């Protein structure tokens, strides 16, 4: 019974799909852990670390895989049309667990299907309660929220907190968070714990209470004035963190160029939705853009910027979604087809595409 974790080859990815703890948990369940040397060095996890937990070490994505019964990865594998073929490295008919961006990447879904493999699109985890244990979307987008501030703070001259000094008083920084989600909330929190005067805004006014519960302060034809009340706040804002993301669609515009011009110079904007368009048309994926005196930071794969902490999490998100099925003693897997998660996850099993949305 082999479970194998390769190494992230997608550009910019530094997270691994495993942890020393997770190893023992798998090892205990009658599994053989295999990971290609230095597959987690980018996540501060070394070969030694694994091998002590009980993991054996491979030398190639290939020599790691061969007869891999179930595979663990953070980012969907690479088709050959991308210059490297990892799918074709997965023993035909194995179990693939990772975030496949499923709904968007048909090309890759079929490559797996052709190798007759069961792919479990983790980014489709059922929005239930038992499932929160195995949600990769919120465990990663959480740290992202933290990072947004750490990165926003870094690119900011002025200090965040209000400091008492013989030279007078240093006022605090005014942060403004768009979209109050797992990501957003963490932003608000850390931002405030840092000393900023945090203030959020979301279209779901059901959040005003969550924001307020974090010491935050919510902002309040309807948008004729709402989208305006924001102006009054944005004009006195130092950090503008945007995290609005509505899937399969380009992120909605929260900060238009027209607005960045009306802002105070020296200010910075973190556009975590940079990849899906960006809540700000000026944000360019990858680097920092400067215009109208404003720095518009739009990094990529933000969780990777927390790659060390985000990894042991992304591992559990898996280990969890998995163990219910490692049958009691028979020592095999058993994906309960009716089990809410599985029948929400799996996009294609031993043969062809099974998920509804794809048909």
């Amino acid at each position: 019974m082999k479970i194998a974790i390769p190494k992230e080859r997608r550009p910019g990815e530094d997270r691994v799909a495993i942890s020393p703890e997770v190893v023992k948990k798998l090892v205990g369940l009658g599994f053989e852990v295999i990971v290609e040397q230095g597959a987690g060095v980018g996540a501060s996890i070394t070969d030694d670390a694994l091998t002590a937990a009980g993991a054996t070490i491979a030398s190639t994505a290939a020599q790691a895989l061969s007869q891999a019964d179930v595979v663990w990865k953070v980012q969907r594998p690479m088709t050959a049309e991308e210059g490297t073929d990892e799918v074709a490295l997965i023993k035909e008919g194995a179990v693939l667990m990772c975030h496949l961006g499923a709904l968007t990447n048909r090309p890759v879904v079929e490559a797996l299907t052709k190798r007759k493999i069961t792919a479990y699109a983790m980014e489709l985890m059922p929005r239930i309660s038992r499932a929160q244990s195995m949600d990769i979307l919120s465990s990663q987008s959480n740290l992202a929220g933290y990072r947004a501030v750490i990165d926003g703070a870094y690119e900011f001259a002025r200090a965040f907190p209000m400091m008492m000094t013989a030279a007078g008083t240093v006022p605090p920084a005014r942060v403004l968070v768009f979209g109050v989600g797992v990501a957003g909330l963490q932003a608000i929190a850390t931002a405030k714990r840092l000393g900023a005067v945090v203030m959020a805004t979301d279209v779901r006014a059901a959040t005003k209470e969550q924001v307020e519960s974090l010491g935050g302060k919510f902002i309040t034809e309807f948008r004729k004035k709402q989208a305006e009340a924001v102006l009054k706040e944005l004009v006195k804002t130092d950090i503008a963190i945007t995290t609005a993301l509505i899937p399969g669609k380009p992120a909605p515009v929260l900060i238009t160029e027209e607005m960045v011009t009306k802002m105070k110079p020296g200010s910075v904007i973190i556009d975590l939705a940079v990849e899906a368009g960006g809540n700000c048309p000026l944000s360019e994926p990858g680097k920092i853009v400067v215009k109208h005196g404003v720095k518009i930071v739009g990094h990529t794969n933000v969780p990777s910027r927390v790659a060390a902490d985000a990894s042991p999490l992304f591992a559990k998100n898996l280990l969890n979604f998995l163990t219910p099925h490692v049958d009691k003693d028979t020592k095999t897997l058993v994906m309960k087809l009716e089990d809410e998660t599985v029948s929400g996850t799996c996009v294609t099993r031993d043969g062809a595409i099974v998920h509804p949305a794809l048909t």
Binding site: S129, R130, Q132, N142, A189, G215
Partner: protein
Amino acid sequence: RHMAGSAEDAAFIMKNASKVIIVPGYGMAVAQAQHALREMADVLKKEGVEVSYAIHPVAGRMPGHMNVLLAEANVPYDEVFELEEINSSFQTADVAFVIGANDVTNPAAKTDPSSPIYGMPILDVEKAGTVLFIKRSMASGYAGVENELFFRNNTMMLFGDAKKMTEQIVQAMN
């Protein structure tokens, strides 16, 4: 139906306990009682009372929600424990101060597979000598499921605002 108490009753119950396990939930966050809470925690600790906070992975409305506030209230990371380290204790603690928390304590999610939280782990609070709930009404939480614990021979309710109540208990103890 359910037993209900007053800030005077909690004071006594806790000023005389040995071990106590504070279970913080979204309620405390919404009320911002991290300070009344820690304040109290001290009074207890001054009486030789044992205190430790139990944090349910999803207590609150965001990962680590109870944490920031508890830190912000200046609460010792060695008094804060997580579900898998704490549960083994309740059954050895005289009191289970549950302030602003519900779903994270519901035993339904270990029982009837129909319930919207079934499958989720919970903090075995119903193992502590006596259990106290410090919420406002008898309403439920996010899962909107009724909590079977409110009606047990070791459960007293302490209706009020997470903060306003803890303040009145600290007050009473002093």
